[PDB]
Amino acid sequence: DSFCCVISMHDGIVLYTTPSITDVLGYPRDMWLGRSFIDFVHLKDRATFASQITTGISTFCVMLRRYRGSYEPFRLGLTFREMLLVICATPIKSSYKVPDEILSQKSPKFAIRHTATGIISHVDSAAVSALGYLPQDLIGRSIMDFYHHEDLSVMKETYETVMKKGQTAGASFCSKPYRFLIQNGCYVLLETEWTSFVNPWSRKLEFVVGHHRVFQGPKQCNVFEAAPTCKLKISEEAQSRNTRIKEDIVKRLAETV
């Protein structure tokens, strides 16, 4: 179930509002006829929207907000018509259906990728329905930021092996299930296969590519949802003892490949 909006260059606002909106999203047709779409999309996604309309004359997700006077996920798919734009905001759901699920083989194939510094550049869309992270939430942060601490000490050896193997013309050696936190805070186990691109001559690690196929869903299903917190621990003798192995896998980007 979707619904549409429409506009463009002279101001914004919204002209139409598919009568299927007082349903799918909460409020009435002419209810939106009021002002600019743009100020309906979460302060967050806002930035990418006005950059995807400029880069068009498709598809990309953003977070829209219901109306009661609880933002929800959406997958805007636009179309440039003669001007004005037709936006069919289809809502997006959470791929997991049970709890501590054990996804089959069909399970989507979503692959995030990152720079030596440890920052994810591109990030498949197939990952927004199984990680509750709309690209923009990520695409720009530190990949090491996610991994589970009681893990990066054994995670390291995995990353390393992407050099040793990344020393070949494009070797791919499949990792072993490793925890990784979603949007709701839970931890899934991806069945990650790796591969990197080392600049042939400067012989440096340009970027990593992880063909992430999920292997086990969250304790509490419904990715997106709300984000709690119960995980602390010796935030002194280890919350810094780890930053050691992290900021060590960062400096483990240097040539020697």
For the chain, the structural domain boundaries read 1-92, 93-257
**d(Cα 179, Cα 151) in Å, to the nearest integer?**
7
SS3 content of the chain, % helix, strand, coil (to 5): 20, 25, 55
For the chain, the farthest-separated pair of C-alpha atoms sits apart, in whole angstroms, at 62
Confirm if 2 and 92 have CB atoms less than 8 A apart: no
Other beta carbons within 10 Å of 123:
23
**d(Cα 141, Cα 211) in Å, to the nearest integer?**
19
Beta strand residue intervals within 37-94, DSSP E: 60-64, 72-76, 80-81, 84-88, 90-91
**d(Cα 197, Cα 210) in Å, to the nearest integer?**
12
Confirm if 144 and 114 have CB atoms less than 8 A apart: no
| Break positions in the chain: residue before each gap, C to N over 2.5 angstroms | 57, 69, 82
**d(Cα 180, Cα 155) in Å, to the nearest integer?**
11
Torsion sign across C-alpha atoms 105, 223, 131, 63: positive
Q: What number does CATH give the domain 1-92?
A: 3.30.450.20
The DSSP output letter for 30 is: H
Other beta carbons within 10 Å of 153:
13
From the list 212, 45, 245, 180, the residue with the least C-alpha distance to 113 is 212
Q: How many CA atoms lie within 13 A of 241 on its CB side?
A: 10
Pairing of the two strands 204-210 and 214-216: unpaired
Identify any residues that bridge with 180 across adjacent strands, giving them in sequence order: 188
Alpha-carbon distances, residue 256 vs 29, 202, 203, 210 (angstroms): 61, 11, 8, 21
Q: Obtained via which technique?
A: X-ray
Q: What architecture does CATH give domain 93-257?
A: 2-Layer Sandwich (3.30)
Confirm if 111 and 105 have CB atoms less than 8 A apart: no
At position 45, the amino acid (one-letter code) is D
Identify any residues that bridge with 62 across adjacent strands, giving them in sequence order: 74
185 conformational bin, left if phi > 0, alpha if psi -120 to 50, beta if neither: left
Resolution (A): 4.0
**d(Cα 209, Cα 112) in Å, to the nearest integer?**
6
Torsion sign across C-alpha atoms 140, 159, 196, 254: positive
State the DSSP H helix or E strand holding residue 190, giving kind and residue range, or none if neither: strand 187-190
Alpha-carbon distances, residue 181 vs 28, 172, 228, 237 (angstroms): 37, 24, 12, 22
DSSP H helical ranges for the chain: 21-24, 29-32, 46-52, 143-146, 149-164, 242-249
**d(Cα 10, Cα 161) in Å, to the nearest integer?**
53
Domains 1-92 and 93-257 share a fold: yes
Which structure tokens are listed for 82? 């003669």
